[PDB]
Amino acid sequence: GSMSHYGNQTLQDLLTSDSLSHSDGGGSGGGSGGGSLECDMESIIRSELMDA
Amino acid sequence: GVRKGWHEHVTQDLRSHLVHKLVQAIFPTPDPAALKDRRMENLVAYAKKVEGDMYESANSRDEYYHLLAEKIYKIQKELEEKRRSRL
Alpha helices (runs of H) in chain B, residue ranges in sequence order: 12-26, 40-57, 61-84
d(CA B10, CA B66): 13
Count up the domains in chain A and report the number: 1
| Domain, as residue range, for A7 | 1-52
Task: Specify the CATH number for the domain of residue A15.
Answer: 6.10.250.1690
- Give residues after which chain A gaps, C-N over 2.5 angstroms: none
CATH class of B1-87: mainly alpha
Please tell me if residue B81 touches chain A, with a CB cutoff of 8 Å: no
Q: Domain map of chain B by residue range?
A: 1-87
**CA nearest neighbour of B54 among A19, A16, B6:** B6
Q: Which of B26, B69, B73 sits opposite A14 (nearest CB)?
A: B26
* CA diameter of chain A: 44
Q: What is the dihedral of CA B20, B26, B29, B35, to 10 degrees?
A: -30
Q: Which of A14, A26, A37 sits opposite B78 (nearest CB)?
A: A14
**CA nearest neighbour of B22 among B7, B40, B10:** B40
Chain B environment of A50 (Cβ under 8 Å):
21, 25, 69, 72-73, 76
